[PDB]
Design a protein around this ligand. Sequence first.
Ligand SMILES: Nc1ncnc2c1ncn2[C@@H]1O[C@H](COP(=O)(O)OP(=O)(O)OP(=O)(O)O)[C@@H](O)[C@H]1O
Length: 248
Amino acid sequence: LYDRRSIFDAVAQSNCQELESLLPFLQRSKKRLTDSEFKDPETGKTCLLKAMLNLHNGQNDTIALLLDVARKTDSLKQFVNASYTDSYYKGQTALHIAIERRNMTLVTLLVENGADVQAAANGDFFKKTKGRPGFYFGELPLSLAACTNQLAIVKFLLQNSWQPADISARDSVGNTVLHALVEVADNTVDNTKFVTSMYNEILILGAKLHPTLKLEEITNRKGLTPLALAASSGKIGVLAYILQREIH
Ligand SMILES: Nc1ncnc2c1ncn2[C@@H]1O[C@H](COP(=O)(O)OP(=O)(O)OP(=O)(O)O)[C@@H](O)[C@H]1O
């Protein structure tokens, strides 16, 4: 037998043995790894998510086993895609965390077992500090992966076989990855530099993958193109960058 507590402890120490008798348990009781009872009743955290927090050296194979179990009952999709429900981390999925942790291997794994690449992490933890904070990138995996300057994962999100990212999706505020990048600028020289070329990179990928899309024309919920946001919020280095590119 297994209660929520039993597994969460097993996960905490990366124990793949105490979960030997796992699969056969919810075969008898036909319980699901996704049942109400197997989540924290106030956050919506699952064992996979506990595993995501309890990393040791960016590794945990309780994950690999946990996923494996979910397919055998085919809890698979809704398991890998369960989100936080507390006001703080609301809408955060395991894929968000893998990226937050800069972990290709776990991004790769989650996407292959069908992580939703468009899932919006929209809780107060993913918007501007109360101050609380903090920190906004907004919302969507691609946006995250860019705003944290993680090119390879930006590429893997957009290019993968399993679910390519929608490069033009808008977060709750209307912002696309180009909008979010403008928001993440802070007018320091190294800041400009990284935003500026990640921006460049996104456009190069837009034009390579989906040529019809006029990315820089897309307005956030306040009617602002990325450029116009840049200028509304005194993000000058980037403003200068965006206009200089249009000039060629
Ligand atoms: N996206 C995140 N990034 C960084 N830290 C996070 C994130 N989400 C949650 N945390 C931190 O990890 C903690 C949860 O860690 P863990 O999953 O080990 O929970 P616990 O409360 O120690 O154990 P249990 O869930 O078994 O009671 C949260 O309280 C929070 O401080």
